[PDB]
Write a protein that binds this ligand. Structure first.
Ligand SMILES: [Cl-]
Ligand SMILES: [Cl-]
Length: 162
């Protein structure tokens, strides 16, 4: 299993604009287009992202391309962030995927706000960090996905995705 496979299970693939779990316009593999309510502002963002008039639908190829860019951006955001980098540096390969996953979904700023849990991951106190991440809006809003990420951090294995 790897970060790409992990995120492809968590996000799914939609080739037509859709709405995320919170209502935002998304397309592809979890690619947020815009937070605005306007389908049109979203169609515009989509065209800008794809380089073509898209009339709201993209190919699998275009979706994968956006996905590749977003994972790369997820990783570079983490390495550039003063709060995240040291957490990342400290983790094994599996748990690193888990943190990239969180950054992909909530952005660097958001993950950066899990100060107490980050501190416990850094200390390798898995069970406590898992308990702490569970009292978050994140956990309460997308519980199944969050349980998967949380178990990956607790255990260090891909079990939850198998
Ligand atoms: Cl983009
Ligand atoms: Cl969920």
């Amino acid at each position: 299993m790897n970060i790409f496979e992990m995120l492809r299970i968590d996000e799914g693939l939609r080739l037509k604009i859709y709405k995320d779990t919170e209502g935002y316009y998304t397309i592809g593999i979890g690619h947020l287009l815009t937070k605005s309510p306007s389908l049109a502002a979203a169609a515009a963002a989509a065209a800008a992202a794809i380089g073509r008039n898209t009339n709201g639908v993209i190919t699998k190829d275009e979706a994968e391309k956006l996905f590749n860019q977003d994972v790369d951006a997820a990783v570079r955001g983490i390495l550039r962030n003063a709060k995240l980098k040291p957490v990342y540096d400290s983790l094994d390969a599996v748990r690193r995927a888990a943190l990239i996953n969180m950054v992909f979904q909530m952005g660097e700023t958001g993950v950066a706000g899990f100060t107490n849990s980050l501190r416990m991951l850094q200390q390798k106190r898995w069970d406590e960090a898992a308990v702490n991440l569970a009292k978050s809006r994140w956990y309460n809003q997308t519980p199944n996905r969050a349980k998967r990420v949380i178990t990956t951090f607790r255990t260090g294995t891909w079990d939850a995705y198998k």
